[PDB]
Design a protein around this ligand. Structure first.
Ligand SMILES: Cc1cn(Cc2cn([C@@H]3O[C@@H](CO)[C@H](O)[C@H]3O)nn2)c(=O)[nH]c1=O
Length: 124
């Protein structure tokens, strides 16, 4: 079974590229990471930092989660990320996405022992 921590890595980690996400990066990645299986997942962010650096965020700046829970953490440093946002003309199963690279602080929700990221909450 896929753990919550594993699902976060599949949905949100892409350490293999620095940023250089082409204009088709999201179209490709949303498909390959299986986020277009039952529906076009409308928004999803990939983090291009090492897994260790992202996992380390769980011991960084504690902040409120968008849902009001208190287990979210904001990175002290900006991180290379790519936001994927479904286009207006996108039609399942042919999910289409706008690919936007940025450098921003991430906010993740962390849970468990070991305490690791399980949701991507926001970037600021
Ligand atoms: C605003 C925002 C949302 N998301 C979606 C998300 C949430 N999650 C969490 O993990 C899944 C498990 O239920 C859910 O989609 C959400 O809880 N995964 N992707 C981004 O990726 N970047 C963002 O800037």
């Amino acid at each position: 079974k896929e753990t919550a921590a594993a699902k976060f890595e599949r949905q949100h980690m892409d350490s293999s590229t620095s940023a250089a996400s082409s204009s088709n990066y999201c179209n490709q990645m949303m498909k390959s990471r299986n986020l277009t299986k039952d529906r076009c997942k409308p928004v999803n962010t990939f983090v291009h930092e090492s897994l260790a650096d992202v996992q380390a965020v769980c011991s960084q700046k504690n902040v409120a989660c968008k849902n009001g829970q208190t287990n979210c953490y904001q990175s002290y440093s900006t991180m290379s990320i790519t936001d994927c946002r479904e286009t207006g003309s996108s039609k399942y199963p042919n999910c289409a996405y706008k690919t936007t690279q940025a450098n921003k602080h991430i906010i993740v929700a962390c849970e468990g022992n070991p305490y690791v990221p399980v949701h991507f909450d926001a970037s600021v």
